[PDB]
Amino acid sequence: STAGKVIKCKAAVLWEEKKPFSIEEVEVAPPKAHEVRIKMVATGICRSDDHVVSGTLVTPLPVIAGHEAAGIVESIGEGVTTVRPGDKVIPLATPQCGKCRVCKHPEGNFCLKNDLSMPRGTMQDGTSRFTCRGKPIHHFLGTSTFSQYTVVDEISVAKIDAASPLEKVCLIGCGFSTGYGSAVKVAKVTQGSTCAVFGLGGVGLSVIMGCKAAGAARIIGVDINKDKFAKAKEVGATECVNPQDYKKPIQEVLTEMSNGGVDFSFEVIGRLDTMVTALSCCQEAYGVSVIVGVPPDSQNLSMNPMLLLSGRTWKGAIFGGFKSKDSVPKLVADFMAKKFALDPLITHVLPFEKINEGFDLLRSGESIRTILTF
Amino acid sequence: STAGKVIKCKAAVLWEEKKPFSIEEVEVAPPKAHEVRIKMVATGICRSDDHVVSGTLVTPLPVIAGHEAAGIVESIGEGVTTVRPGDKVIPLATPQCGKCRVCKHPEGNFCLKNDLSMPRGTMQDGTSRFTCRGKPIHHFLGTSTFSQYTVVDEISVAKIDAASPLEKVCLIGCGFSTGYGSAVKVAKVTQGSTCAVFGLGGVGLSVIMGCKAAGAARIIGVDINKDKFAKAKEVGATECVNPQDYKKPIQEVLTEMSNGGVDFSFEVIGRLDTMVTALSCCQEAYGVSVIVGVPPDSQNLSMNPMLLLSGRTWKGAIFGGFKSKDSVPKLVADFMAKKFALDPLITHVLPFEKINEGFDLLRSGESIRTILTF
Ligand SMILES: NC(=O)c1ccc[n+]([C@@H]2O[C@H](COP(=O)([O-])OP(=O)(O)OC[C@H]3O[C@@H](n4cnc5c(N)ncnc54)[C@H](O)[C@@H]3O)[C@@H](O)[C@H]2O)c1
Ligand SMILES: NC(=O)c1ccc[n+]([C@@H]2O[C@H](COP(=O)([O-])OP(=O)(O)OC[C@H]3O[C@@H](n4cnc5c(N)ncnc54)[C@H](O)[C@@H]3O)[C@@H](O)[C@H]2O)c1
Numbered sequence: 001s002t003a004g005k006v007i008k009c010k011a012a013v014l015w016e017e018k019k020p021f022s023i024e025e026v027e028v029a030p031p032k033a034h035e036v037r038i039k040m041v042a043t044g045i046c047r048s049d050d051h052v053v054s055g056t057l058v059t060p061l062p063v064i065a066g067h068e069a070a071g072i073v074e075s076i077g078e079g080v081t082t083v084r085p086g087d088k089v090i091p092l093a094t095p096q097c098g099k100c101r102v103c104k105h106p107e108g109n110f111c112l113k114n115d116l117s118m119p120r121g122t123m124q125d126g127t128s129r130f131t132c133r134g135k136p137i138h139h140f141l142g143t144s145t146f147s148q149y150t151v152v153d154e155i156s157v158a159k160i161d162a163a164s165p166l167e168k169v170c171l172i173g174c175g176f177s178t179g180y181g182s183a184v185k186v187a188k189v190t191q192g193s194t195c196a197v198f199g200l201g202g203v204g205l206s207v208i209m210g211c212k213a214a215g216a217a218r219i220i221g222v223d224i225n226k227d228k229f230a231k232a233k234e235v236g237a238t239e240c241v242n243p244q245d246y247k248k249p250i251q252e253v254l255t256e257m258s259n260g261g262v263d264f265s266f267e268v269i270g271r272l273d274t275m276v277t278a279l280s281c282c283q284e285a286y287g288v289s290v291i292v293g294v295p296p297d298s299q300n301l302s303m304n305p306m307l308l309l310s311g312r313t314w315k316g317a318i319f320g321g322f323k324s325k326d327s328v329p330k331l332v333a334d335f336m337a338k339k340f341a342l343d344p345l346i347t348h349v350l351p352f353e354k355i356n357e358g359f360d361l362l363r364s365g366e367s368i369r370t371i372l373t374f
Numbered sequence: 375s376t377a378g379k380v381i382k383c384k385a386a387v388l389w390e391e392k393k394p395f396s397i398e399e400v401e402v403a404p405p406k407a408h409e410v411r412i413k414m415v416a417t418g419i420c421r422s423d424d425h426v427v428s429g430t431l432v433t434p435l436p437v438i439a440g441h442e443a444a445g446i447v448e449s450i451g452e453g454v455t456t457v458r459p460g461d462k463v464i465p466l467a468t469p470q471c472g473k474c475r476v477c478k479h480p481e482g483n484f485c486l487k488n489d490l491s492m493p494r495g496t497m498q499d500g501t502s503r504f505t506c507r508g509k510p511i512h513h514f515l516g517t518s519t520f521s522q523y524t525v526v527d528e529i530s531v532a533k534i535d536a537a538s539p540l541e542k543v544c545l546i547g548c549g550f551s552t553g554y555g556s557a558v559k560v561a562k563v564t565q566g567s568t569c570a571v572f573g574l575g576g577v578g579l580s581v582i583m584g585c586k587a588a589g590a591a592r593i594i595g596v597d598i599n600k601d602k603f604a605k606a607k608e609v610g611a612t613e614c615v616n617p618q619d620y621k622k623p624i625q626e627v628l629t630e631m632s633n634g635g636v637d638f639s640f641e642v643i644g645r646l647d648t649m650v651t652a653l654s655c656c657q658e659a660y661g662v663s664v665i666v667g668v669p670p671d672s673q674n675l676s677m678n679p680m681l682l683l684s685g686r687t688w689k690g691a692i693f694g695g696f697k698s699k700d701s702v703p704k705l706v707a708d709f710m711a712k713k714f715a716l717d718p719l720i721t722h723v724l725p726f727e728k729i730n731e732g733f734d735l736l737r738s739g740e741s742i743r744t745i746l747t748f
């Protein structure tokens with residue numbers, strides 16, 4: 001068959017920053033002990049993948065990017081117990097080793113085996129499974145889903161329901177779960193509360209979905225692209241505001257709208273200025289602000305700590321606070337049980353070969369999530 | 375009687391920054407509607423009073439400072455219902471109006487009638503009850519307790535047990551309650567956790583008391599004055615560290631000591647740099663850091679928001695998160711019942727007339743709390 005053998009397949013290789021992806025043939029080694037080789041079925045285009053192209057996020061190149069996906073197990077290495085050939089799976093960009101102090105903590109999810117804090121771009125064993133034109137190619141976040149086949153560590157993959165539609169549930173691999181959990185789990189939005197959400201992309205829409213599910217009475221969407229407002233209202237924004245329409249800074253506008261500050265605010269963009277704005281707009285004695293967006297590499301923000309001394313809480317999270325391997329199958333089960341919707345996030349579905357076109361739709365403001373199909 | 379009449383008495387007036395207090399005769403007007411005139415019995419010297427002298431904390435001058443105190447009601451104005459002449463009371467530097475959105479919120483305590491955010495240095499009605507040399511003198515935080523008699527708004531005073539020892543319980547009016555609440559109420563320190571406390575003055579000692587009460591396993595005190603370590607261990611610190619002993623920055627030292635970051639850290643000094651260090655030293659995925667110290671006026675800190683995105687929570691609070699008028703009598707009742715100790719905080723006692731000597735003791739690093747007696 002293909003098990004135990006090198007696979008030659010198509011992938012999208014990023015050779016350098018700020019260039020289009022190159023679609024070409026790569027060789028994918030078979031999985032070693034505690035590794036899983038996956039035939040991809042669908043992958044989403046997340047703004048974080050674009051951060052790798054833009055240099056906003058630094059990771060070793062050349063690289064196969066992509067992290068929000070779903071596929072089917074082709075083969076397993078020795079010692080693998082949690083998935084089998086033929087299983088539907090979602091790769092986990094935040095792993096769950098189950099052994100580190102974070103995995104063992106009731107509230108921690110940022111497993112210490114992650115490849116985000118100090119990226120190496122390899123498997124856990126420090127080597128790569130990918131070659132292209134005779135050269136080794138790096139992995140990204142232990143996932144690398146812009147390829148017909150990938151290899152992942154077992155701690156970076158979850159088995160999901162055999163009947164799930166992979167072309168939708170790939171979003172549970174990153175953007176949906178990130179936004180929804182940021183609201184319900186990280187902020188712990190309360191019934192009757194007022195919320196402000198900065199950035200109305202796939203992730204911000206998912207934060208709105210969570211705020212609405214948590215029973216917020218008011219959800220104010222904030223974006224400089226007013227074409228984003230109709231969909232934000234559809235998924236539960238009660239009002240939308242464009243900072244460019246006001247003479248005053250938007251923190252002041254939001255503080256006035258909310259009669260002295262909002263209960264919960266969320267930065268879902270990745271800009272330092274909006275992080276400080278979002279903080280400021282929450283009520284000074286009991287407000288909570290959650291950073292979800294990823295800002296550029298190695299840049300510090302400036303703020304007045306009196307913002308905090310009066311009582312505000314400021315926090316951030318990766319992947320909505322969800323312990324990844326425990327939560328992903330449950331979220332897919334909840335989707336199958338119609339507990340939330342994913343279609344509002346999906347604006348375009350393209351063949352994999354049109355990856356560059358998909359990125360152009362995101363950069364231009366025209367898409368939310370484009371799903372690529374293999 | 376003195377009821378309805380101007381009282382001539384002694385107070386400590388601050389005519390300008392960076393100068394000694396002037397002990398001299400002032401005129402104290404009678405209380406107007408919903409105001410209370412108090413005969414002071416004891417007041418503590420808190421670092422925040424020194425911040426007024428140094429210009430760290432900006433409030434209008436000339437001023438009668440002092441905010442941590444206890445006394446006996448001399449008279450009440452029209453419509454006062456919560457205290458009576460002869461009652462023992464503690465002035466409340468953070469009011470509790472009971473009517474604003476913060477007072478009604480289950481968590482909030484920084485009442486919107488406070489005089490900290492936009493200091494006026496007046497009574498609630500925008501006027502002063504103090505004259506000296508024929509000139510109006512400002513109030514401080516609606517309390518002004520460096521005077522034989524003061525006048526406070528009813529929302530800034532709590533009745534307390536008639537049998538309580540005023541020369542002790544005055545510390546419930548600021549430093550004790552602030553440190554203790556910061557640990558038990560704001561951080562919500564958990565049993566078996568590791569805590570780091572930056573600054574071992576009267577408030578940092580009360581944070582240690584709180585961490586110990588909450589069942590922390592390890593409580594690491596941090597101070598550049600090693601003379602502070604013996605009392606910090608007496609009240610519950612398990613280890614103390616002086617950053618000046620180390621080649622590496624103290625956040626790295628604490629991260630290594632706690633095998634990857636502490637559960638709860640507290641900044642109890644008032645420096646921008648230690649606020650960021652304290653955040654950094656808590657574990658990146660589930661650590662909590664609370665700012666207690668008062669920063670220098672109008673100065674911003676610089677920080678990397680990746681510290682938050684991994685999962686840290688960062689918050690601050692006034693007065694330990696306690697709703698002031700509800701909480702102060704209960705804290706006094708608990709002191710009377712021996713639920714916590716105040717004596718460890720009291721290192722010096724002086725007559726009021728020796729207030730400048732009490733400030734010299736604070737500035738030299740020799741004292742924790744000096745209590746002044748009228
Ligand atoms: N924390 C996590 O685990 C995690 C997971 C996924 C994505 N992210 C990050 O979340 C962010 C959002 O991702 P996405 O996929 O939704 O991106 P996106 O590009 O689809 O949406 C961002 C939105 O922000 C808006 N925007 C841009 N500048 C703005 C400004 N100054 N003011 C207000 N709105 C502004 C854009 O118009 C857009 O609608 C990114 O930074 C991404 O890297 C984080
Ligand atoms: N949030 C509130 O409600 C509230 C209430 C009370 C006091 N405060 C503030 O809390 C702070 C502490 O008050 P206090 O009365 O305990 O003061 P304090 O001056 O007695 O104690 C501060 C301690 O910090 C130490 N310190 C100084 N610089 C240091 C450094 N670089 N590293 C480590 N330690 C250092 C000093 O040696 C001292 O022991 C002050 O800023 C004060 O204004 C805040």
Ligand SMILES: OCc1c(F)c(F)c(F)c(F)c1F
Nearest residue numbers: 116117118294318680683684
């Ligand atoms: O530097 C990259 C980087 C991130 F993009 C994060 F979101 C994060 F939490 C982190 F710790 C990190 F190191």
Ligand SMILES: OCc1c(F)c(F)c(F)c(F)c1F
Nearest residue numbers: 496500501502510511512513
């Ligand atoms: O005149 C304005 C003014 C006041 F309203 C005061 F309350 C005060 F203390 C003071 F010194 C002053 F100048």
Ligand SMILES: [Zn+2]
Nearest residue numbers: 097100103111
């Ligand atoms: Zn782990």
Ligand SMILES: [Zn+2]
Nearest residue numbers: 046048174175
């Ligand atoms: Zn993503």
Ligand SMILES: [Zn+2]
Nearest residue numbers: 471474477485
């Ligand atoms: Zn109030």
Ligand SMILES: [Zn+2]
Nearest residue numbers: 420422548549
């Ligand atoms: Zn004080």
